[PDB]
Amino acid sequence: SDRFVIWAPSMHNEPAANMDQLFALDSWAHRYMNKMDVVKIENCTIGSFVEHMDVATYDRMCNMGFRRSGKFLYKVDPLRNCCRLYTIRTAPQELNMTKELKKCISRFATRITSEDYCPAAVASSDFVGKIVNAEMNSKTFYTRFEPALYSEEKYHLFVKYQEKVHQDYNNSPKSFKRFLCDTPFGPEAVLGTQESWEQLNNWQRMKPGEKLKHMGPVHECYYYEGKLIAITVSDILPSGISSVYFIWDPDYSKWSLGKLSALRDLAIIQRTNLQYYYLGKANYGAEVLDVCHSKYIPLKPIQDMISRGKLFVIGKKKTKVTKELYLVDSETGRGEGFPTDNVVKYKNIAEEIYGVGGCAFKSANESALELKELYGIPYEEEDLDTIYHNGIPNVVPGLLPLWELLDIMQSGKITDLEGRLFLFEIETEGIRPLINFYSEPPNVKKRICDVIRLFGFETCMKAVILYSEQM
Missing domain, CATH: 3.40.630 (Aminopeptidase)
Incomplete structure (x- = not known):
């Protein structure tokens, strides 16, 4: 119930690290196998400086794939970062x-x-x-x-x-x-x-x-x-x-x-x-977090993470995906597991979504164009192709897909934040309520959207977003 007082999320750079393993998917390694000299591999960290939160909220955040460094609640981009860290319990x-x-x-x-x-x-x-x-x-x-x-x-x-x-x-x-x-x-x-x-x-x-x-x-x-x-x-x-x-x-x-x-x-x-x-080598008997479902799967069947650490999205063979996976609010960060039936020989659909011919990228570019054009939220088409050459990418596994955000905008669900979400610009003599989302400045809109994408919508309802307009 305690208020979740945070700064607007950002993406930080701490680049310090066998040139064929630093890719999160095999297809991106294949595409840029001979061009390693021109690839701008950076050690990214998407996070937010948390000013106050209760222990239950941080428990939820751990179960969403977060770790804290002091007051900095963060997670790595599991698709673009040189080191993929897995939330394992x-x-x-x-x-x-x-x-x-x-x-x-x-x-x-x-x-x-x-x-x-x-x-x-x-x-x-x-x-x-x-x-x-x-x-x-x-x-x-x-x-x-x-x-x-x-x-x-x-x-x-x-x-x-x-x-x-x-x-x-x-x-x-x-x-x-x-x-x-x-x-x-x-x-x-x-x-x-x-x-x-x-x-x-x-x-x-x-x-x-x-x-x-x-x-x-x-x-x-x-x-x-x-x-x-x-x-x-x-x-x-x-x-x-x-x-x-x-x-x-x-x-x-x-x-x-x-x-x-x-x-x-x-x-x-x-x-x-x-x-x-x-935890945040070889044999554990533990279970890792699929951030695209915010659900835990045992680690024995998933030898690709134990061998190469490359990404993995669980799914069924008989189902074809059109866009990124819907994140269900009220279940993200609840530590829910996958069903233990061994008849559903769950395949890895990470390549279908975040691979070279991924549908996530065109879906996100179209959703971002539509957001910016219809609601004045500054999203731009970014990864039209070539996900390797500031801000936060439009396609990151574990973040709320842009089409869900667009549905929140279109269904009017975004209006549920007004009266619950509070904003705090330091230079405005005080903390203020959210009266109308669509009348806010575009940067404030994108800050609220980043909070929704990174920490969930139900968490954003109880948030206090601190911001200054110099970054």
């Missing part, structure tokens, strides 16, 4: 325990507990039981959940990690605050109450039926023998836990703290009566 009950993970957990339980540790008879695959049992019977290792706030030792460990692992030496305390301490959440969501922190710290002792009181960003600090060894920046969501970033002492590369942190997060999710883990 994992439940602790459905995780494929490999042999390396079992060795990791065994060595962990051996190093944290004394030699006098007589272990229980927990199964070799119940990693949650081993983690909880060994960590409760250990006097050398512990963790502490605490608010996402700045401290000098946290920043020092951050710098050491960044420079010895990621080889990044351009780190300042402002960047650490702005990336791992600044959050778009309320003061309760960040700070909370001491009682909720005591509950979350006793997650090993939580019994089924008991609910987490705390929902918001947290820092889990790993302490071994009094020394800070790792920090897990994560978001406690109503549906689970979303990992934002992970930091670990390089001197402890013996521990494989990334795998250990993932397994411990799964153990927490199971004990804290949460369901999913939002």
Whole structure:
């Protein structure tokens, strides 16, 4: 119910990255296989600076394909970007325990507990039981959940990690605050109450039926023998836990703290009566997000993402598509799965839609021309062909197709935003209501349309769009 106060969405450029794998579809790689020198591959990021939102909204956004960097809620263009990141969720009950993970957990339980540790008879695959049992019977290792706030030792460990692992030496305390301490959440969501922190710290002792009181960003600090060894920046969501970033002492590369942190997060999710883990290699037993449906499909049948990471739109063979897939408001971001019938041998229709001869492109150009000509919204035909050589493209998988936006305009559904959506120009002495959409300036119209396309229509109904007319 909390208002969704955001800046107008934009597209940012951070280009820093075997020349045959950086394409999201095989046909576009084939078309530009010999012209790689003239292709302008950039590392794009479509997002929006969020000024305030509640935890439930960010949960919905995760289930729409979003991740946050500080206050910047973003997603990558899964068709044009050099790196396609997939929103993948994992439940602790459905995780494929490999042999390396079992060795990791065994060595962990051996190093944290004394030699006098007589272990229980927990199964070799119940990693949650081993983690909880060994960590409760250990006097050398512990963790502490605490608010996402700045401290000098946290920043020092951050710098050491960044420079010895990621080889990044351009780190300042402002960047650490702005990336791992600044959050778009309320003061309760960040700070909370001491009682909720005591509950979350006793997650090993939580019994089924008991609910987490705390929902918001947290820092889990790993302490071994009094020394800070790792920090897990994560978001406690109503549906689970979303990992934002992970930091670990390089001197402890013996521990494989990334795998250990993932397994411990799964153990927490199971004990804290949460369901999913939002990761954001080879064998998982997890399920990824089809953004064109905003629905999750298991990852085993989809070997193309596991092998090449190229795009994938699920569909049926006996159905031919004419335009991009309709996004159903009130179901996008709800974590809905695909039916588990194996008779419908779902094919990949991503090439039919976003490929070279894709229908999405002509449909979007025609819809954009019609929008600009009939309603004064500044859309231009862009990808008449050659999707590789500012603003936001007319065809992006996971965004609301332009024909749906045109239907919203034609059906008069757009008038449902007026009286609900509020706008905030900083230089106008105040926040103002939306009285008439069609009488707004064209740039304001396109900002509202970008919010609708990127975050959904029902979310835009409860939004507050901040804008200045200098960008």
